[PDB]
Each structure stands twice: as C-alpha cells, then as structure tokens.
C-alpha cells in the first residue's frame, strides 16, 4: 500500500461547473413572444438607478433631522478634552462621553419620525413615490429581496460601532476632533485680525449670522453638523464666489498672507468632512483623461504645490522629515550616497559596535537577528542621514535637486505630450490599433506614477515624536491629490487590455424571485426547474408560472418516445432540519413527542458540554428513528437503514449517518411527443445543456467538467458525489457582430503557427470564424456540485504525510525550480540521492491518440518578447505575456500531477519570502504565486481523466493531498504533499562535494588584497598537471561560519566566461599574468613573492581572476548552447565535475546544467527534512522544524557523498 492509498475522501469541496444552454424547438421565439428578456434586462440595469433614488431619500432624511438636534454633552466633551491632558482615567470618561454622544445622535435617528419603515418592504412601495420614476420604483412590485444587500449597509450607516462609513463615528470623532483643533488654532490667528477683510465681507455675504469667532467657539457645532453647515464652514475656510467675479477671500489666504515676513509657522484651518471613470468609449475616456491631467488639472496643481514645497524645503527642520523604511530606501540610498547598499552598511556598523563583541566574525543566527533588528525600525530621520553622510553632502540640497530633476522630467514629458490636451484633438484610429497616442498616455501616467512612488517614502507611518507637522500638513494635502492618479491608471490600463468582446451578463429570473434554488421533487412546482436526459443530449426544463404543474400528470409512456426525468430527493441539512420539523406545532399534533422527550430536547442534553448523556439521548435517537419512519415523504423516497441505538456514541454520528444516506436520484420516465407538444404550447421552456463535448463529432477525451457532469447521473455515483442546488442561469449579449470577424475562408490552404508540426499547412472544408461564440448570444448555465460531501478518512493532513514519510523507507521526492535557460526544471530524486529523471519543461508533450506532438513554450515567450521590444513595451504586450504565462502554468499541472502519481512522491517547491529572485528568470514572482495557487487548487482534488472513474485515482475517488489555500503567508513551510523550502545556496554549488564560494572578491584596495592574498595557505603550481592549485582554510575569513569541510584544494582547468561577451581561459591567463610580472612560479608558496608589488593594476587584474576561478555559473546570455556549470574543486576520484561532461548521457547521475542543479539542490533540502522526519517521536512530528539553515544544509550536502 503506497503513499497515495490513504489520501482520498478526506474533506469536502465545492466546485462549480459552467455549461452553455441552447433552446430547442420554438422555445426562443416563445421567449421573445412572452417578453421574458426585457424584464430582467431592466431588472439588471435599473438597480443602480433605484439605488440612486433611495440614496437621495436617505440623504434628505439625514439633512432633515440634523436640523433638529442640539447636543448637550458637547461642552462637557470639548472642555474636558482641551483641559490640558492629565487624565488618570479621565480619557476613559471622555470615551464614555463620546460613545454616549454617538448614542444620543443614534437615539435621535431611532425616534426620527418612524425609521422602522426605512429598510423593510414598503420603502420600495409607499414613501419613495411621493415624475416618470414612479414606474422605475414600481418596476419591482413583486420583487423586493434584491435590496437586502443594500438595506443592511445603509442600516449600518446609522450605527454607533465607530465604523468607517457610519454617520456617528464621522460626526463625533473626525468632525469634532477637527473642530476643536480649529478652535484651539483660532488662538493663533487673532494677531492678523483686520475687520475690513475678515468681517466686512464674509459675515455680510455668507450667513448674516453671529461673527467668525462663533464658528471657533464651540456652540455652533450643532449648526455645522449638517452638510449645509459644513458648506458654510468650508466657505469661511476657502472662500465663496457667490456667482460673482469677486473670488472672495478665505481664512487660508489670510493665514497665507502672514508669511509675507518670510515666516508662517502658524497652521491653517483644516477643511471639514461633509456627510455623503471611463471604461465604455474612446471619446469619453480621452475626455476624462484630459479632465484629470490637463495643465490646469487638480493633480497637476498638486505637483506644482509639491515642487514649490521642495523648493522652499530648507526652512523646515531636518528632525522630522521621516523617510520610510523598507523597499524604497535602497533607491534613496542610490540617490543620496551612490550605491544600493550604504545606509545598510552604516546601520550595520552602528549596530555591531554595540552588540558585536570585541571580535569581528559573525554567526548566521546573529546575521538573521541583525536583519530582523534592521527591519524592526519604522523609519529614519533626515538628520540621521546627515549623520551617515560624510563631508560635502547636504541632503537639503541633494534631495531638493533630485526632486526638481524629477519635476522637470515630468515637465519634459509634458513637452512631449502637449499635443494631447489640445481642444482640436482628433482620434484617427481606435486605441486598440493606434500606438503613438496610447504610448504617450502610458509615458505620462507612468512618469507621474513614478514620481508618486519616489515621493511616497516621506510619511514615516506617523504616530511618532515631534515631526514637522507644518510640513506634513501640506504634504498630505498634496499627496491625497497625487494618489488620485491610480484611479486613472487602473482605468486606462484595464480599458486597453480588455478584449474586443465583453462578458457582461444578468441573472435570469423568469418572472419569479424564488428561482431554481433546489431540485427537490415535491418542491419542484415552487422552484420551477427540472432536468431531462435522452440518449446523451441532456436538457434543462423551465415551467412557466401560469402552468407550473406540467410534469406531474405524465404517464409512463409505452410508445417508446421518452425523456427520462430526474427525481432528486435531498434531505437538506439534517442536523438542523430534524429539530426544525419534529417540534413545530404540527408534528407535535400528529406524532406526540414523549413528555420526557420534549423536555430532553427543550433542555437540550443531546449536545456536548457534559450534559451529554448516552442513554438519555438514545431515546431521542429512537424518537427521531420512529418519527422518520412515520413521516410519509421520508419513509418512501429514500432508503434509510441506520445502525442500532447503542451504535451511536454521538447524535453528531447519527446526523452524519442520515446526511450520508439521505440523497437519491433515480429516473422515472415520461413521454416525448406530449412533452414536445407541451413545449409547443409554450407552457414549458426547454434548454439543452451543451458544450464542445456533447457534439457527435468528439472523437477524443472530454473536458474534466463534462466528465464530472456525465458522472452526476451514473450508478457509480456511490462515491458521495452530489449535485447540489443554488444553480443559476445567465444571458449574454452580442459583443461582436457577425460581419467584422476576420474569417478564414473555406477550401483555402490555411496557415499554421506551431513550428514543430509536420503538417506545415492545412486546409478545411468550411469556415472557421474568429471568436464565433460572441456572435449571437448564449445562455450560460451554472450547476454547482459538491464533491465528497461526506468525508470518511478525516485527519490532519500535515501530520499524516509526516507519519507516512517516517515509516516509509524509500520515499521519492520531486523538486521544481525556475531558471533562466529554461522556464521550470524538474528533477526526481530517490530516497538516497540518485537523480531518477531530469528534464526541462519548455516543451509540452500532448499525448493524445498515439501521436506525441510536442510544442515549445520558450520559443513562444521569446518571440512574444521581441514584439514587446519592437512595440515600445505597451500594455497589450504586457498582459498578453502575463496570460501566456498563465496558460503555461496551467499546462504544467498535468505533468506535475501525473509525475506525482507515477513516482509516489512529495513535491518540493521554492519558498519565496526567503528568496532573492534574479530578475532574468522568465517566471517572475507574481506568476509564480499564481502557479502556487493553480497548483494547490488542482491538488485539492487530483484526478486524471484517462483513468477509469470507479478505480482509485479516478473522477469519483480523487486524491486530496493538500489543504485549501488560506492567505499569502499561510502558504509556508508545509502544505500536504507540497513542501516549501528556502532557495539559499541552490544554484551555485558543486553537486559532487559541496564547495561553495563565500569570498567577497570584488577588489577594494591593495591594503585589503595583501592580507587577503597572504591568508591563503599555498598558492603553487603543479607542472605535471599544469594547474594553479590554490589552498585555504575557511576559518580565517569573514562571513564564513557555515561550511563544514573548510579544506578546499582549488584548481584551474576548464575555461570560464567573463562579462567585460568575454570568453577567456584560466590557467593560461594565470600564466600570462605571472609572466607579465616575471616569476619563477614553480616553487610553491609564491605568496611571499606576491606580497611585494605595489602597482594597483596587477592586483586589480588578479582579483578579477580570483573571481573567475571562483565563478561556477557561466552564461553566454546570447545563445542557449554553453550554459555550463563547472566546479574548481575535485572529489576523491581526482576529477572535478563539468556540466557538458554530464550533458551527453541518457540518464545522468548528476545534474545536466544550471537550472537542473537548482532543482536537485531543493530536492536535497527536502531529503534532509525527511532525514530529520526519521529522527523524532510521533509526538513531536507536528513540531519538527523544516527551515533548514545554511550551516545545516552545507553540512548535509558535504557529508552526504563522503
């Protein structure tokens, strides 16, 4: 019994299929005559309009009753907050008063003229009538419940839970804490009070109320609570126009006049919150883009405010301008210092001078703790960057000139794009076929977006010390406007990358709100939908509500024209259906529940909680048994055969028993001619369930979904597969028209595009239109199933795989690694270390009838990336490539699944959050995470279609070897048969012995190089092998606390590849350098001669040769021919490993090339994890660590071979 005979029927699932539906006979013209499409087209479209009307009435309700509330605890909150801190649980009384104030406005709303009829049924009926909108709100006269996704959230607008969208939290804890802040900051505007400007005009043209000090004194908060009051308040801040050309001044401008003496240093009055994009057509999207980025747009004025802010930046202090820690701080290091790694070096030294000892060597755990302590910090001060900086580095100039360079770059791309915001602009071609216009828009949007990404790190997540609030107050006041460009970026991008066709659909209801919920016989006259089989052309039946019983009075016809017809008896949810029925006032008046039975259910001792009594709940079990026997519908329609009363240790066990059994679909027949005459009468509607496998030409294997759906009505349906309910139906529209499809004509030799087909050209007898499926409409149908509804082998999979792998004795392992020369690379390793099968996954085999036609994806990728290159790298090319990768990581999964079945393994997989991608790899991080998703999705229910359905591994008894996916971090360190493993030191490693370089040999100085060249043990030269054998211990080098052997006798032969494309050899290069500098280098230990020279270029051309002795990976990066991995240390047999030495075999015992080596090492790390799986008890198997360290891994990979 191998390692997959356990893992089936382990837990539930719920897929859902999606077949098409063609109407048969006169059903389509019957629908058009009875007009059953216009109603639901309206019932899709008018919903946002009726939402608009109800939002109109709701906002009128708020602005109605807010003119009738004067808060009484407001003074007692304001003064007690602005009382000057010193709480000792007085802030707790402040919060009590705050929630009581929210309760006061909540009580005002509750008693606010009814309000109980604000989310019930009559709101669509009665109040909202009192134009032509009466039919609009009257269009839903028999259909109310679709508003319940609105009547809940607009109720939660009126809560007191301090939620975001609600009224109460806003008007008490954002408006009031802005109002009292402006009340205090009113103390710092009294020194500029000129009545000719602040009083002679504002009070006369705004309110004619009491003057400007009334809005800062706190007793018109009850007047400003309405949105009219917020309008008047933001008028006194900003300045009203009163439809005249005065442009009357505001308090922002009066406080802006104060810095005429070049010192503002007084915060302005922040405006108050009030109380409550394209994607269709080319002219519209161009106009809204003009609206949002012309030379007087709000975003553009925000850039102007930001550039003048960073022009006058030097007046603010350098003690508060916090730069955000994290990703962007590398580019900030690159632009403040010169390299990607200097801030981290200064912080490194600043930390190690405190926590490092008086030695200098490190451990890897101390390095990981060092990295954790560096990621502990939230942000950095600009003053600390001046502290990091040496002389002649003033950040207040450097960042200023950087940002003015960026702003002038945006101005230069405005000078590029100035032909676009002009009034007489023309569209000569649509944006699908035009390039220059859309690439211009792309450059604009990406330039402003890059500017936002550069500005972004000046937040420091707030909640800090005295930060420069006088700077942040306008900084966020421009940044909120600069963040609006994402609403244009995620409008223009998903406008241009959308298909020409369109997948909009509306739910079809057929005049009824209660539509196809279930398939129950004796509820089918209510649900009004049934399913008929005949041969194999399946059918969906819709009965009209005027004639909702056209299937009951049908005879078992004997003139041999029949449709078989379902019955579908399903007891739904038997743990909470049985007490719903057997205590519900009519069963209590038909089948008397015992006096002690009613009491035992009413007290409820059948549940757990220690009130659980076996021979007490067993009488309840017998009562359920006998009553289900006495029930007329459920005595007959199922075959209930339970256990005995002592054979249920839990009523949960009995519920599982009745849930297991209570489902049966059979087929009682019907006529054919009377059914088709009936659908000719129009009392039925009949659709055929159809896809591209129910046709009578399909001479191959079906779609995995049609295999399931054909298996829903088998007598093998014993594997607990169950057609559930919740089915829907849908309807599309003709996105395309028929004429303008580019159509390949008939009887012409049509082209090909897969180059590895021997039939290099073919021809057909008919047409094959481009995208025929969107020419007409089609009825999409969904029919959701629930695989493995009753689970049996239930356990924790993450422990069961481990307790399986320990007791196993030769457990196979797959590895999967990305790469540069190939997309992925599979390596299958035995329980020892022998490579069973190593191959690429660039070529995809399609093993149909007998004919293994392969197809490449790597050539497809590069041939599309050349179009990306030649087409200025625009969005259509980007998303085409992303979808091609998505199709590729679809078609990988069949190979991985079949490989898992063929070798009985556990997949290893490159962990990501410990990873350092390389950029060039073709499958990047986003596509790899999608591969993770579309691998654990499929290994939730592994099935191969060619197998027999009844046998294990089939469509009834699939493998479940994972869990469901949860969250993008919770996918870590184990998932069933997928293991996650850190990808450190997996590509540049000698597979024979395990030598890895750890030597930082990028040249710095002769001051370092002399000690570095003296630290070696014996640089000599062997003449009987012509090799420059080096020798060293590792313990005399920094960053070297991981290796285990540390006795590495290096060598030289095998040429390597430099970059400078720079092809060199090695031992001849060493000899020519040493004959450039004139050495008798045949009497070893030549370090004594090498520590005499004093010119720079000798050591600079020696470091660059040490590094080429150490460089194991060689990419010629223009061809796929020489990607050779060579290792300058040899094993016990005196031969060091070469890749091309191992490429030309059939099945090697070592990796072929670089990507395969990257797979093989990951497989080795999982093998180490299995080795530690073999060395614990079964009581720690859930705790055995898998995160194998660098030290442990190098030790295992060296001492595996010996």
């Amino acid at each position: 019994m191998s390692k997959l005979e356990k893992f089936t029927n382990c837990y539930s699932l719920s897929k859902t299929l999606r077949f098409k539906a063609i109407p048969v006979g006169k059903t389509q013209e019957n629908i058009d005559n009875k007009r059953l499409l216009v109603e639901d087209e309206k019932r899709a479209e008018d919903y946002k309009g009726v939402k608009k009307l109800l939002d109109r009435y709701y906002l009128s309700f708020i602005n109605d009753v807010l003119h009738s509330i004067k808060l009484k605890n407001l003074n007692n909150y304001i003064s007690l907050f602005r009382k000057k801190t010193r709480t000792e649980k007085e802030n707790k009384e402040l919060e009590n008063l705050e929630i009581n104030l929210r309760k006061e406005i909540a009580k005002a709303f509750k008693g606010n003229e009814g309000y109980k009829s604000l989310f019930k049924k009559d709101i669509i009926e009665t109040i909202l009538p009192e134009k032509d909108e009466i039919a609009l709100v009257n269009s839903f006269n028999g259909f109310t419940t679709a508003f319940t996704g609105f009547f809940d959230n607009r109720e939660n607008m009126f809560s007191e839970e301090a939620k975001s969208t609600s009224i109460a939290f806003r008007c008490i804890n954002e408006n009031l804490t802005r109002y009292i802040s402006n009340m205090d900051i009113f103390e710092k505007v009294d020194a500029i009070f000129d009545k000719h400007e602040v009083q002679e005009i504002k009070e006369k043209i705004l309110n004619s109320d009491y003057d400007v000090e009334d809005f800062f004194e706190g007793e018109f908060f009850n007047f400003v609570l309405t949105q009219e009051g917020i309008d008047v308040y933001n008028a006194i801040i900003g300045g009203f126009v009163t439809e005249s050309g005065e442009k009357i001044k505001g308090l922002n401008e009066y406080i802006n006049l104060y810095n005429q003496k070049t010192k503002q240093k007084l915060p302005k009055f922040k405006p108050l919150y009030k109380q409550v994009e394209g994607y269709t057509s080319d002219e519209e999207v161009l106009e809204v883009f003009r609206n949002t980025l012309n030379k007087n747009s709000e975003i553009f004025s925000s850039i102007k405010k930001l550039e003048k802010l960073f022009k006058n930046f030097d007046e603010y202090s350098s003690a508060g301008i916090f730069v955000k820690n994290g990703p962007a701080i590398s580019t900030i290091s690159k632009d403040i210092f010169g390299e990607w790694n200097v801030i981290r070096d200064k912080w490194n030294a600043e930390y190690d001078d405190i926590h490092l000892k008086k030695k200098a060597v490190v451990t890897e755990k101390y390095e990981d703790d060092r990295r954790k302590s560096f990621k502990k910090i939230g942000s950095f001060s600009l003053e600390q960057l001046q502290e990091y900086a040496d002389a002649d580095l003033s950040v207040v100039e450097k960042l200023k000139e950087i940002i003015i360079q960026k702003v002038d770059e945006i101005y230069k791309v405005y000078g590029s794009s100035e032909k676009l915001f002009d009034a007489d602009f023309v569209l000569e071609k649509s944006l699908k076929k035009n390039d220059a216009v859309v690439a211009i828009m792309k450059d604009l949007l990406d330039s402003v977006k890059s500017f936002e990404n550069y500005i972004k790190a000046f937040f420091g997540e707030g909640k800090e010390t005295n930060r420069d609030e006088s700077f942040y107050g306008d900084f966020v006041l421009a940044y909120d406007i600069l963040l609006k460009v994402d609403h244009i970026y995620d409008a223009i991008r998903n406008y241009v990358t959308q298909k020409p066709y369109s997948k909009d659909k509306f739910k079809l209801y057929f005049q009824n709100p209660q539509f196809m919920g279930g398939w129950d016989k004796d509820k089918e006259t209510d649900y009004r939908a049934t399913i008929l089989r005949y041969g194999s052309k399946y059918y969906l039946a819709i009965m009209d509500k005027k004639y909702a019983k056209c299937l009951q009075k049908i005879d078992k016809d004997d003139v041999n024209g029949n449709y078989e017809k379902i019955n579908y008896k399903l007891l739904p949810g038997p743990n909470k259906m049985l007490p719903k029925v057997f205590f519900s006032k009519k069963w209590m008046a038909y089948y008397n529940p015992s006096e002690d039975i009613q009491k035992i259910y009413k007290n409820g001792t059948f549940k757990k909680g220690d009130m659980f009594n076996l021979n007490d709940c067993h009488k309840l079990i017998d009562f359920f048994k006998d009553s289900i026997s006495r029930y007329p519908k459920w005595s007959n329609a199922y075959d209930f055969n339970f256990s005995e009363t002592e054979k249920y240790k839990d009523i949960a066990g009995f519920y599982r028993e009745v849930e297991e059994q209570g489902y049966k679909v059979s087929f009682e027949s019907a006529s054919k001619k009377e059914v088709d005459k009936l659908v000719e009468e129009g009392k039925l509607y009949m659709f055929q369930i159809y896809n591209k496998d129910f046709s009578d030409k399909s001479h191959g294997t079906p779609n995995l979904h049609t295999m399931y759906f054909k298996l829903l009505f088998d007598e093998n349906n014993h594997g607990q597969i169950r057609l559930s309910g919740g089915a829907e139906l849908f309807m599309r529209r003709a996105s395309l028209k028929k004429e303008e499809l580019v159509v390949h004509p008939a009887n012409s030799p049509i082209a090909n595009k897969n180059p590895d087909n021997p039939k290099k050209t073919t021809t057909l007898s008919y047409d094959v239109y481009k995208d025929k499926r969107f020419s007409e409409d089609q009825y999409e149908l969904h029919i959701p199933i629930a695989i493995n509804k009753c689970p049996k082998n239930i356990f924790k999979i993450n422990t069961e795989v481990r307790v399986l792998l320990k007791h196993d004795d030769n457990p196979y392992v797959i590895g999967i690694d990305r790469g540069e020369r190939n997309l992925l690379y599979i390596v299958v390793v035995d329980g020892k270390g022998n490579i069973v099968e190593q191959y690429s996954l660039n070529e995809i085999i399609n093993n149909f009838n007998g004919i293994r036609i392969k197809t490449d994806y790597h050539s497809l990728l590069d041939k599309k990336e050349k179009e990306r290159f030649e087409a200025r790298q625009n969005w259509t090319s980007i998303e085409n490539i992303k979808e091609l990768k998505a199709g590729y990581i679809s078609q990988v999964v069949h190979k991985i699944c079949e490989l898992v079945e063929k070798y009985d393994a556990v997949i290893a997989l490159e962990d990501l959050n410990s990873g350092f991608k390389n950029s060039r790899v073709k499958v990047e991080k986003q596509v790899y995470q999608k591969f993770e998703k579309m691998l654990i999705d499929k290994l939730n229910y592994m099935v191969d279609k060619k197998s027999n359905p009844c046998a294990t591994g089939g469509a009834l008894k699939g493998y479940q070897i994972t869990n469901k996916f949860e969250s993008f971090k919770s996918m870590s360190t184990q998932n069933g048969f997928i293991f996650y493993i850190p990808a450190w030191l997996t590509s540049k490693i000698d597979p024979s012995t395990g030598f890895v370089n750890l030597l930082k040999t990028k040249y710095t100085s002769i001051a370092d190089s002399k000690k570095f060249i003296s630290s070696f043990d014996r640089i000599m030269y062997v003449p009987e092998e012509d090799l420059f054998e080096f020798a060293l211990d590792y313990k005399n080098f920094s960053r070297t606390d991981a290796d285990y052997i540390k006795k590495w006798k290096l060598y030289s032969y095998g040429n390597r590849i430099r970059i400078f494309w720079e092809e060199v050899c090695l031992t001849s290069a060493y000899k020519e350098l040493f004959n450039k500098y004139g050495i008798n280098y045949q009497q070893g230990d030549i370090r004594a001669l090498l520590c005499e020279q004093s010119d720079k270029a000798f050591y600079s051309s020696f470091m660059a040769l040490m590094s080429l002795m150490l460089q194991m990976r060689n990419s010629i990066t223009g061809r796929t021919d020489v990607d050779f991995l060579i290792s300058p240390v040899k094993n016990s047999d005196g031969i060091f490993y070469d890749s091309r030495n191992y490429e030309a075999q059939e099945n090697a015992i070592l990796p072929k090339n670089a990507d395969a080596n990257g797979a093989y090492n990951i497989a080795r790390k999982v093998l180490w994890a299995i080795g530690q799986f073999k060395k614990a008890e079964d009581e720690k198997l859930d705790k055995v660590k898998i995160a194998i360290s660098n030290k442990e891994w190098l030790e295992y990979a060296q001492t595996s071979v010996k």
Binding site: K121, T148, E161, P513, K586, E966
Partner: protein, 156 residues
C-alpha cells in the same frame, strides 16, 4: 468590476502580509485571525445562499473551539442556539404576527397553496434570515475591532 476587484483584494492582501509582525505577543495568532477573516469574507460574501435549502454551504461553538486553542479572547456572540433561522421550512411552521397584516388585505388564510400568500411569507422569512445573519456578522466585526484597537493591528 475587475480593476476594483483586483485593487481591493491586493490592498487587503498586502495588509495580511504586513500584519504578520505587528502583534509580537505570545504566538502566531495571525493564523487564526486570518482564517477567521476569510471566513467572514465568505459569510458576508454570500449570506444569501445560506437561506436556500441545499446550497453549497456548511458554527459559533466551532469558532470558539478553534479560538480558545490559540489563546485569544472569545467572541461573545449574540446567540448559540441558531435553530430558528428560517430557510426552507416552508412546510413546517405557523405563529407569525403578520397574519394580522395579511388579513387586513384580502390574501387568503394559513394555507400556502395560494400563489399570492406564498411570496408574502417568503419575503418576511427572507428578511428575517438576513437580519439574523448580519447580527451574527456584526459580532465578528466587533471582535476584530476590539482585537484591532487593543493590539494596534488592522482587520475589518
């Protein structure tokens, strides 16, 4: 309805990636919280198909069991008994007060074969089901807000 779909999910996904370090309390309670949060995001996604008799679905004692094991405070639910949320027992009840309403208009008596009174009780039981489930859902959001503003994380 694709751009905002990806945007609102990758924002929240970034927050679930980001908040795995803020807690810095005894344990990996982030796992239980994100598991609860996605459970919330299924529940509030399609609460409506819980009303159907046999939809693809499948409480409070189970959540409290999986929450006590990690050591959080519990949820303080609104009810534990759960057995009165009406779904498709439309053959298995009678006591409702709005028969006074239904007799104020014509309607018919308490026999549901009339095609007019059927939807007139279906509406009320649908709204009562949704009104029960959001009272459930508010309890989970209250638990997340309490655990949010006690430990300074982000969940809503």
């Amino acid at each position: 309805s694709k751009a905002m779909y990806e945007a609102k999910e990758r924002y929240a996904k970034k927050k679930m990636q980001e908040n795995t370090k803020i807690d810095t309390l005894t344990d990996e309670q982030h796992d239980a919280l994100a598991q609860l949060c996605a459970f919330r995001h299924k529940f509030h996604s399609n609460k409506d198909s819980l009303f159907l008799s046999e939809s693809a679905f499948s409480m409070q004692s189970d959540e409290n069991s999986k929450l006590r094991e990690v050591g959080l405070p519990t949820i303080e639910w609104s009810f534990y008994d759960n057995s009165h949320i009406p779904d498709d027992s439309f053959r298995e009840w009678f006591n409702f007060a709005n028969y006074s309403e239904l007799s104020e208009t014509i309607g018919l008596e308490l026999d549901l074969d009339d095609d007019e009174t059927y939807e007139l009780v279906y509406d009320e039981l649908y709204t009562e089901a949704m009104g029960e489930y959001e009272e459930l859902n508010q309890d989970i959001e209250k638990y997340l807000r309490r655990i949010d503003e006690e430990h300074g994380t982000q969940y809503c």
